[PDB]
């Protein structure tokens, strides 16, 4: 039940778990949206979609195995789920239809059908979703002129201007062996440990990933798309988080989980909570919270996303959330910290140990590429109880106190005051 890693050409990792019985084997490429230029955006999306359609049609018809994928910023988590006794076939298919050969896959007809399907999908995502749209806009506005602001889906202008050659060029400049691994989360033990290294079962295109000239940055900005047609409102604050592989990941995660989520239309959420939730609930101010502190290998983001219903009362919601963040960095009760520790413990336990093998496989791939070695949750629990009020005070004195913010929302934001009524009030002039 212990994760094993090595380094033999291509990194192979394994998180054995005979609890579940859905074996999964796949790859986790250490590149994606962050590793590609603004002018050719949805190349990763197109890859994922051509796979997820035609290879799905092939695999289900031939054998029994359902293949998924995921792209967040720098992954292509082409996980291929299977039965416990059917991992060799899955690996053989993966190495015979993803790395090579790509001729039977990139026919002009299949590529064009997938291209139009991707266009339709991104279009109706733009026309329907809203919290995801404002989150993508928040990324695109926080990291202007940097290979991290471009979204994980892409723009129609960038989507339309690529046919075959750009796709193959990106394939040959990022589907290498140096920054590609194999993940076997499920209930396999060592068959994957030896079958990945075989006479020829190896990714093509030996070499290295082209290093980006600039990594990441930050700057305060706004991208609002004010349109009164939409019913509700949407906003998303942000403060620069802490990158992965740093002695600040868990303290930032706790500093985010203190305030916690909130759904105003649930009998089991209004009653519980801390000061801001009560002071909001006295009137009607907000309708959802999401304190998220996302982190990436270049830089991380500590955010605060809402989707309210009241339109005249945006300013008061923002003012209260800012005063609560100041309260976080000035003085915190010990019971608050203890409750946060317990909640974050259970949240990590649920997230990392969900029964679905695909989630565990993707997270293991992310960690093995970024951290260089898997961090078993035992050490996380051991090192999480040591987080103390002084440490959080110190961390918030750096990341939060008078630091530039970025917000970006679509809807009836118009009531929101522009910048100096949401920025120069993070200290309330009496600390």
């Amino acid at each position: 039940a212990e994760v094993t890693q090595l380094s033999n050409g291509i990194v192979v990792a394994t998180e054995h778990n005979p609890s579940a019985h859905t074996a999964s084997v796949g790859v986790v490429f250490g590149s994606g949206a962050a590793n590609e230029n603004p002018y050719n955006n949805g190349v990763s999306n197109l890859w994922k979609n051509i796979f997820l359609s035609k290879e799905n049609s092939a695999v289900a018809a031939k054998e029994g195995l359902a293949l998924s994928s995921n792209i967040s910023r720098d992954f292509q988590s082409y996980i291929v789920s299977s039965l416990p006794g059917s991992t060799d076939k899955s690996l053989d298919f993966l190495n015979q239809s993803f790395i090579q050969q790509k001729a039977n896959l990139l026919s002009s007809s299949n590529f064009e059908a997938t291209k139009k399907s991707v266009l339709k999908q991104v279009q109706d995502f733009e026309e329907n979703d809203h919290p995801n749209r404002v989150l993508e806009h928040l990324h695109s506005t926080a990291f202007q002129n940097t290979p991290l602001s471009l979204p994980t889906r892409g723009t129609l202008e960038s989507l339309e201007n690529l046919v075959v050659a750009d796709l193959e060029s990106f394939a040959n400049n990022h589907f290498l062996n140096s920054n590609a691994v194999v993940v076997g989360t499920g209930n396999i033990k060592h068959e994957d440990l030896v079958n990945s290294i075989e006479s020829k079962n190896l990714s093509l295109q030996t070499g290295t990933k082209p290093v980006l000239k600039k990594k990441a940055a930050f700057l305060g900005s706004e991208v609002r798309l004010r349109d009164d047609t939409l019913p509700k409102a949407w906003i998303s604050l942000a403060v620069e988080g802490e990158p992965v592989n740093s002695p600040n990941y868990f303290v930032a995660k706790l500093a985010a989980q203190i305030f916690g989520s909130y759904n105003a239309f649930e009998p089991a959420s209004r009653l519980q909570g801390i000061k801001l939730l009560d002071n909001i609930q006295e009137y009607q101010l907000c309708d959802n919270f999401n304190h998220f502190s996302l982190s990436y290998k270049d830089s991380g983001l500590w955010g605060f996303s809402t989707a309210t219903r009241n339109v005249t009362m945006i300013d008061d919601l923002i003012h209260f959330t800012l005063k609560q963040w100041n309260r976080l960095t000035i003085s915190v009760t010990d019971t608050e910290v203890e409750r946060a520790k317990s909640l974050l413990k259970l949240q990590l336990g649920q997230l990392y140990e969900s029964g679905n093998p695909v989630n565990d496989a993707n997270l293991l791939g992310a960690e093995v590429l970024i951290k260089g070695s898997k961090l078993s949750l035992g050490e996380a629990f051991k090192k999480i109880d040591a987080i103390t009020v002084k440490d959080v005070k110190a961390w918030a004195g750096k990341r939060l106190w008078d630091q530039d913010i970025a917000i970006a929302g679509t809807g009836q934001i118009e009531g929101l005051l522009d910048y100096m009524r949401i920025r120069s009030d993070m200290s309330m002039m009496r600390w």
């Binding site: 202007q144 602001s149 723009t155 202008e157 700057l219 991208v223």
Partner: peptide, 24 residues
Amino acid sequence: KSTYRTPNFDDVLKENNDADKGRS
């Protein structure tokens, strides 16, 4: 020109030194 393409602020943006001292 999609909305994500932030217009070139390079004329007015501060030089490549962040702003961790400008607050001072």
